[PDB]
C-alpha cells in the first residue's frame, strides 16, 4: 500500500513491477535532464545584455534538435517495448480466478475445481479494527497462492470498473460483456492493496481490492473452507 509522504512507486511485489521501476528510473532521469536543460537555457538566454537581432539561419541547428530527440525517444522506446512484450509472453498459469465488478464491490470466482465465489466489500470506517486501514480493508480478501503464475479474468455486471493492484503493476478494466485477462505472480507473501480505477458512480472511491498471498497449502485449505 502507499505510505505517508510517498514520492514514487510502491515497492515492487512482482518481477514485472520491478522491471517497470527500473524503466521508470531510466525515463525519469531523461525527463529531469531535459527539463533542467530547458530551464537552464532559458536562464542563459535571459542573462546577457549582448544582443544579436538580425536574421538567424536555422537549417544547421534544426538537425541537432531533431536528431537528438529522435535518438532519446529510441532510447526510451527500446526498453519500453521490451517490457511490453515480456509482460505479454506466454507463462502457463496454475490457477484461474475471475473478478466481477459491481456497484460498489467486487465479487470473485475460483471455479477451476469447485464452485467457489464470494463478494468483497470495503470495511466501513466505523467498523475498522484497531490498526486497519481506512478505505482499504475488505471483509473477504482475495486469497491467492504465492510464487505461482495466476490468470486473473476481469469483467463487470453493471458499469465500467477497473481492477488495480499498484504493487503488482496491475490495472485491467472491468467491462460488461467482455472478459479481460491479466497475469499475476507475487514473489512474496503478504497483503497487497488496490482501488477501483474507473469512475463507476456514487461509491467509486469505496470498492477496494485486497490480495492475500500465502503458501499453496494454506490457499487450498482456505479454498475448501469457502465452499
Amino acid at each position: 500500500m502507499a505510505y505517508p509522504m510517498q514520492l514514487g512507486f510502491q515497492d515492487a511485489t512482482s518481477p514485472i513491477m520491478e522491471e517497470l521501476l527500473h524503466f521508470h528510473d531510466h525515463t525519469l532521469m531523461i525527463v529531469f535532464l531535459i527539463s533542467s536543460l530547458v530551464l537552464y537555457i532559458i536562464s542563459l538566454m535571459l542573462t546577457t545584455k549582448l544582443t544579436h537581432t538580425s536574421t538567424m539561419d536555422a537549417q544547421e541547428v534544426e538537425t541537432i534538435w531533431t536528431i537528438l530527440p529522435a535518438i532519446i525517444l529510441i532510447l526510451i522506446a527500446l526498453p519500453s517495448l521490451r517490457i511490453l512484450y515480456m509482460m505479454d509472453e506466454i507463462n502457463n498459469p496454475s490457477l484461474t480466478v475471475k473478478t466481477m465488478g459491481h456497484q460498489w464491490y467486487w465479487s470473485y470466482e475460483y471455479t477451476d475445481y469447485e464452485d467457489l465465489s464470494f463478494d468483497s466489500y470495503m470495511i466501513p470506517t466505523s467498523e475498522l479494527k484497531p490498526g486497519e486501514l481506512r478505505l482499504l480493508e475488505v471483509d473477504n480478501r482475495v486469497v491467492l497462492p504465492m510464487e505461482m503464475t495466476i490468470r486473473m479474468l476481469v469483467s463487470s455486471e453493471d458499469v465500467l470498473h477497473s481492477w488495480a493492484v499498484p504493487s503488482l503493476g496491475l490495472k485491467t478494466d472491468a467491462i460488461p460483456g467482455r472478459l479481460n485477462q491479466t497475469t499475476l505472480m507475487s514473489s512474496r507473501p503478504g497483503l497487497y492493496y488496490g482501488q477501483c480505477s474507473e469512475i463507476c458512480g456514487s461509491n467509486h472511491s469505496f470498492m477496494p481490492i485486497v490480495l492475500e498471498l500465502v503458501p499453496l497449502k494454506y490457499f487450498e485449505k482456505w479454498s475448501a473452507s469457502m465452499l
Binding site: 546577457t48 545584455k49 549582448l50 544582443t51 544579436h52 537581432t53 538580425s54
Partner: protein, 105 residues
C-alpha cells in the same frame, strides 16, 4: 565568404559616401547594431564623419553611446574604442557622452 576585414570595409564605404543622407545614416546605424559585434573604430570613425557632413552633433554622441551598449558587460571595449577615436573626436569637436554628463542616470 566575407572576412571580417571585408565586412568592415563595406561598412566604412557605406558611411563614407559623401552625400549620404539622414535616412541612410540612421538605416546604417540601426542595422549595424543588430549584429553580434561592437563595430570597429574605423567604422565608427566613418559614421561620425557622416554625422559631421549631415550637421548632426547629437547623432554622433548617440553613436558613441550605442558602442558602449553593444559591448554589454565587457567594460574594456568602450574605453578602447574611445581611445582609438580621440583624434577624430578632437578634430570634429565631438564630446563623449561622459563629457556631456549623459552617462548619469
Amino acid at each position: 565568404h566575407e572576412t571580417d576585414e571585408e565586412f568592415d570595409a563595406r561598412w566604412v564605404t557605406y558611411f563614407n559616401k559623401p552625400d549620404i543622407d539622414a535616412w541612410e545614416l540612421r538605416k546604417g546605424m540601426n542595422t549595424l547594431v543588430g549584429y553580434d559585434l561592437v563595430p570597429e573604430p574605423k567604422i565608427i570613425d566613418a559614421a561620425l564623419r557622416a554625422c559631421r557632413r549631415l550637421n548632426d552633433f547629437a547623432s554622433a554622441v548617440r553613436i558613441l553611446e550605442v558602442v558602449k551598449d553593444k559591448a554589454g558587460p565587457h567594460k574594456e571595449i568602450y574605453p578602447y574604442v574611445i581611445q582609438e577615436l580621440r583624434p577624430t573626436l578632437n578634430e570634429l569637436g565631438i564630446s563623449t557622452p561622459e563629457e556631456l554628463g549623459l552617462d548619469k542616470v
